[PDB]
């Protein structure tokens, strides 16, 4: 009765980055990584 | 079309190729999804690649990457003319041939 409650749907997320300021002590180039749960993590994937 | 079976795993025709017997009318022209079973919301149950016996023993409502087969039970009803069942014994004499 619990297994039959299992379902999956495709969700859509969009994010845009307009600006970034007030940085301190920057030694190298900056990149950001954003993920949802266990999805979108660049170290847990080979191709997305 | 070869994935339609009876309870014993024997091949049967696709659900949409089923016609009503003489003396009977369909109560349901289309097959209903059986949600009365241990199946997901789509009526599907899942299982592991069918074992060497070719007679799979376990199915679950859950979908897993382990499961390579999926099954549904369909329900369809028919009703007989309210007269005599003498007609029902006319097409049941040929049990085997």
From Swiss-Prot, chain A:
What top-level branch of life does the organism fall under? Eukaryota
Q: Let me know which tissues express this protein, per UniProt.
A: Expressed in skeletal muscle, myoblast, myotube and in the syncytiotrophoblast (STB) of the placenta (at protein level). Ubiquitous. Highly expressed in skeletal muscle. Also found in heart, brain, spleen, intestine, placenta and at lower levels in liver, lung, kidney and pancreas.
- Annotated compartments: Cell membrane, Sarcolemma; Cytoplasmic vesicle membrane; Cell membrane
Q: How does it assemble?
A: Interacts with CACNA1S. Interacts with ANXA1; the interaction is Ca(2+)- and injury state-dependent. Interacts with ANXA2; the interaction is Ca(2+)- and injury state-dependent. Interacts with CACNA1S and PARVB. Interacts with TRIM72/MG53; interaction is required for transport to sites of cell injury during repair patch formation. Interacts with RIPOR2; this interaction occurs during early myogenic differentiation. Interacts with CAV3 and PARVB. Interacts with AHNAK; the interaction is direct and Ca(2+)-independent. Interacts with AHNAK2; the interaction is direct and Ca(2+)-independent.
The entry assigns this protein to a family as follows: Belongs to the ferlin family.
Q: What does the entry note on its domains?
A: All seven C2 domains associate with lipid membranes in a calcium-dependent manner. Domains C2 1 and 3 have the highest affinity for calcium, the C2 domain 1 seems to be largely unstructured in the absence of bound ligands. The C2 domain 1 from isoform 14 does not bind calcium in the absence of bound phospholipid.
Disease linkage: Muscular dystrophy, limb-girdle, autosomal recessive 2: An autosomal recessive degenerative myopathy characterized by weakness and atrophy starting in the proximal pelvifemoral muscles, with onset in the late teens or later, massive elevation of serum creatine kinase levels and slow progression. Scapular muscle involvement is minor and not present at onset. Upper limb girdle involvement follows some years after the onset in lower limbs.
Q: What does this protein do?
A: Key calcium ion sensor involved in the Ca(2+)-triggered synaptic vesicle-plasma membrane fusion. Plays a role in the sarcolemma repair mechanism of both skeletal muscle and cardiomyocytes that permits rapid resealing of membranes disrupted by mechanical stress.
Name the chain's protein.
Answer: Dysferlin
**Species this chain originates from:** Homo sapiens (Human)
């Amino acid at each position: 009765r619990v297994e039959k409650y299992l379902r999956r749907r495709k969700y859509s997320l969009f994010a845009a980055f307009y600006s970034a300021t007030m940085l301190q002590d920057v030694d190298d180039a900056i990149q950001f990584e954003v993920s949802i749960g266990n999805y979108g993590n660049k170290f847990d994937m080979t191709c997305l | 079309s070869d994935n339609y079976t009876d309870v014993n795993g024997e091949k049967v025709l696709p659900k949409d190729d089923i016609e009503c017997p003489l003396g009977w009318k369909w109560e349901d022209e289309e097959w209903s999804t059986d949600l009365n079973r241990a199946v997901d919301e789509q009526g599907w149950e899942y299982s592991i690649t069918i074992p060497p016996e070719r007679k799979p023993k376990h199915w679950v409502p859950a979908e897993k990457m382990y499961y390579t087969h999926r099954r549904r039970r369909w329900v369809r009803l028919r009703r007989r003319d309210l007269s005599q069942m003498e007609a029902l014994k006319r097409h049941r004499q040929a049990e085997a041939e």
